[PDB]
Design an enzyme around this catalytic site. Sequence first.
Site: not given
Length: 458
Positions: A115, A171, A174-175, A395
Amino acid sequence: WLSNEATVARTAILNNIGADGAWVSGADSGIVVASPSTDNPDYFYTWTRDSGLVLKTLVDLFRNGDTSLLSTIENYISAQAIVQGISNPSGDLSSGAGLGEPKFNVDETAYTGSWGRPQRDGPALRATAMIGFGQWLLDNGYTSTATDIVWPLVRNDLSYVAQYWNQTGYDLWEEVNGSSFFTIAVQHRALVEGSAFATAVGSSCSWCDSQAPEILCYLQSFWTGSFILANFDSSRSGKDANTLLGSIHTFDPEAACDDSTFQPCSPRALANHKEVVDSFRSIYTLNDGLSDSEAVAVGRYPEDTYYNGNPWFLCTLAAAEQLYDALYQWDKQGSLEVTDVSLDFFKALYSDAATGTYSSSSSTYSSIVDAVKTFADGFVSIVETHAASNGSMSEQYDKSDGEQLSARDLTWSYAALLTANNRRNSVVPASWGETSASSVPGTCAATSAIGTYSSVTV
Ligand SMILES: *[C@@H]1O[C@H](CO)[C@@H](O[C@@H]2O[C@H](CO)[C@@H](O[C@@H]3O[C@H](CO[C@H]4O[C@H](CO)[C@@H](O)[C@H](O[C@H]5O[C@H](CO)[C@@H](O)[C@H](O)[C@@H]5O)[C@@H]4O)[C@@H](O)[C@H](O[C@H]4O[C@H](CO)[C@@H](O)[C@H](O)[C@@H]4O[C@H]4O[C@H](CO)[C@@H](O)[C@H](O)[C@@H]4O[C@H]4O[C@H](CO)[C@@H](O)[C@H](O)[C@@H]4O)[C@@H]3O)[C@H](O)[C@H]2NC(C)=O)[C@H](O)[C@H]1NC(C)=O
Ligand SMILES: *[C@@H]1O[C@H](CO)[C@@H](O[C@@H]2O[C@H](CO)[C@@H](O[C@@H]3O[C@H](CO)[C@@H](O)[C@H](O[C@H]4O[C@H](CO)[C@@H](O)[C@H](O)[C@@H]4O)[C@@H]3O)[C@H](O)[C@H]2NC(C)=O)[C@H](O)[C@H]1NC(C)=O
Ligand SMILES: *[C@H]1O[C@H](CO)[C@@H](O)[C@H](O)[C@@H]1O
Ligand SMILES: *[C@H]1O[C@H](CO)[C@@H](O)[C@H](O)[C@@H]1O
Ligand SMILES: *[C@H]1O[C@H](CO)[C@@H](O)[C@H](O)[C@@H]1O
Ligand SMILES: *[C@H]1O[C@H](CO)[C@@H](O)[C@H](O)[C@@H]1O
Ligand SMILES: *[C@H]1O[C@H](CO)[C@@H](O)[C@H](O)[C@@H]1O
Ligand SMILES: *[C@H]1O[C@H](CO)[C@@H](O)[C@H](O)[C@@H]1O
Ligand SMILES: *[C@H]1O[C@H](CO)[C@@H](O)[C@H](O)[C@@H]1O
């Protein structure tokens, strides 16, 4: 529509919180699940960021009179005592590093797969959520709960921010591994209100006090001269709803239009608003035929390829919320200013805009605030157009046809709706102390301070 949608939003959020939320059987008590979707995509996890933003919203509603939210908040507090102590791939509690873990399984176990970890905004957002409830507890005579339970939980997260703020991480999307505007902004906020909470409980936070001005010093670097850069370092444009979210989640209703803290009505945040929103005008067919004075569907960042790259409900709502926040500030101040920095923002909405200061009693002010209000409402209308007939919000909504996609019933979409609607109604959160925490040091230091980590049992 907003009124009835806000009704759906409150209940939908609770449906996503364990143990008894209708959509999330299996989730522990006080555990906020990001979405009930377990496949395509699998969001059946708890994120520290999503939970903290959701709880801040709930605490704010609770504090404004929605008292039946009490047990939900209490349950979250209990859950977080457990969650903080879960040794995970980011680390453990004793070193503090474990607190940077992005997400957990809903049964309060570590997520063991690879992750984008750590994400250092998490502890800041959890602290911010908990502090609000700590404040209420003190105000209503629950001193022992505030001092023995809430404060120690908060102390762990404040210690994390003070020790680790000046380190790279992923960030909020998550990237991107680096240093991120949203993360730095919310960390600065957390240390400031965290120090005030420490004092209020008869304690202190020396690491909060030394680190806050350094985080603020660093935060200034994100201003490019025309917009707020999302991340160091990236070869993207740097235009990102990241920075809209940074502004609205660090909005202080006591604050003036302070550039240093990128308040919603600051010239910097207004200039940034236009740059970010404009990046979505040409790239989505959903926005075809709309002019620069009209609201548009807003995604995360123009380079996004997640699900092909689409408008997000929470990002479109953030565009509305910053404007509602600016309106509140301009009205409280009794004036509005047009600067060289913010001129393009104003000109697009009011063609006769010119640099200067216009009183709330004045004619020019009336035309501008009217245009700003209509523009902000425009974003909410787009959201309303693409929410399901029963009020459900996913989303994302599709870049061409506005059809809902990605995770269904995203808790954070519901929280964004509730906050946007509140600010539209001039309903604002508690101050966080921005008025005595906007002074930028003459020289910035690459540094840290050490607090204390200790496991809390409830
Ligand atoms: C407005 O109306 C809407 C329309 O009705 C409504 O939305 C619907 O809400 C219901 C819930 O009441 C959803 O039902 C679930 O469907 C799951 C499968 O959905 C797929 O297939 C559907 C049919 O073709 C598609 O429609 C659906 O597409 C949707 O979702 C996509 C992905 O997010 C999205 O991209 C699309 O746009 C679209 O939104 C999707 O492709 C099904 O799996 C699920 O069953 C579980 O939950 C039931 C109870 O909620 C249980 O009875 C059942 O046994 C299953 O439980 C498992 O999962 C739960 C969590 O989801 C856990 O709590 C359980 O404990 C259990 O978990 C075990 O198993 C897991 C693996 O399966 C594992 O991970 C765990 O560890 C554990 O072992 C359910 O029936 C329906 O999908 C929604 N439809 C739409 C169109 O969105 C909406 O709610 C209404 N809104 C309001 C405000 O009222
Ligand atoms: C830990 O904290 C330290 C101290 O705050 C912090 O150091 C600062 O980093 C920033 C960002 O890298 C530096 O600012 C840069 O300076 C270089 C050199 O002149 C510039 O080339 C950079 O320009 C970019 O950003 C501009 C906007 O600021 C854009 O306009 C431009 O196009 C470029 O994108 C950039 O300004 C700053 O100088 C240092 N300060 C010190 C004292 O070293 C460090 O980054 C922190 N690290 C982490 C991981 O948190
Ligand atoms: C932000 O806070 C500083 C002090 O930290 C003030 O001097 C400024 O005017 C603003 O209120
Ligand atoms: C405003 O306050 C900060 C510390 O909070 C100083 O660094 C600055 O020089 C000014 O006094
Ligand atoms: C980083 O630097 C500061 C000095 O500016 C110290 O106070 C801190 O201990 C750390 O070494
Ligand atoms: C954070 O990092 C600083 C170095 O700038 C150390 O001095 C401090 O002990 C902490 O580990
Ligand atoms: C650190 O503090 C926690 C929370 O009060 C305790 O539970 C632990 O034993 C240690 O003293
Ligand atoms: C603090 O951490 C300890 C050790 O993981 C746990 O036992 C406790 O419940 C709390 O989370
Ligand atoms: C709270 O207290 C318990 C003792 O009941 C510890 O085991 C736990 O680590 C936490 O400090």
